[PDB]
Ligand binder design. Structure first.
Ligand SMILES: [Mg+2]
Length: 157
């Protein structure tokens, strides 16, 4: 439907912009978990821009999907998507290589009918990063704003 926004259920170290399109890890190095405000479609491309980078932290963001309505998760969020959420049923996420986490890159990803998650950077496919996603339930993005990237923007095309 409408352009993707961040869910109001998020980590303690996250601030979301007024229009809901920009999530920042405002302090520290963890508790940086975020979700999409609405479920996403199979084959819908999620496009995220690395809007802000800190030179004081290293590492890549973690991204993927959850079959859990983020409202059901409030007061329940751990420090990390990996391993902490991924250990629970209905979360699929992996780290993005830190070489891709540079200012103004666009990460795109989607889950296909087969339940595989394909990703790329600046419109160049990198491949399948995740497999076995439950395509029979509603899915929300999970993006853990970990590492040198401290601000990410959902892009509207
Ligand atoms: Mg804090």
């Amino acid at each position: 439907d409408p352009p993707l926004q961040f869910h109001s259920v998020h980590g303690d170290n996250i601030r979301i912009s007024r229009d809901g399109t920009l999530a920042r890890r405002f302090e520290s190095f963890c508790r940086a978990i975020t979700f999409s405000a609405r479920p996403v479609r199979i084959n819908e491309r999620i496009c995220v821009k690395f809007a802000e980078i800190s030179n004081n932290w290293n590492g890549g963001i973690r991204f993927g999907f959850t079959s859990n309505d983020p409202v059901t998760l409030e007061g329940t969020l751990p420090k990390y998507a990996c391993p902490d959420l991924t250990n629970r049923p209905g979360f699929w996420a992996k780290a993005l290589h830190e070489q891709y986490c540079e200012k103004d890159n666009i990460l795109y990803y989607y889950v296909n009918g087969a339940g595989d998650v394909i990703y790329g950077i600046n419109n160049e496919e990198k491949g399948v990063i995740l497999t076995g996603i439950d395509t029979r339930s509603l899915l929300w993005t999970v993006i853990d704003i970990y590492g040198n990237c401290t601000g990410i923007e959902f892009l509207d095309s």
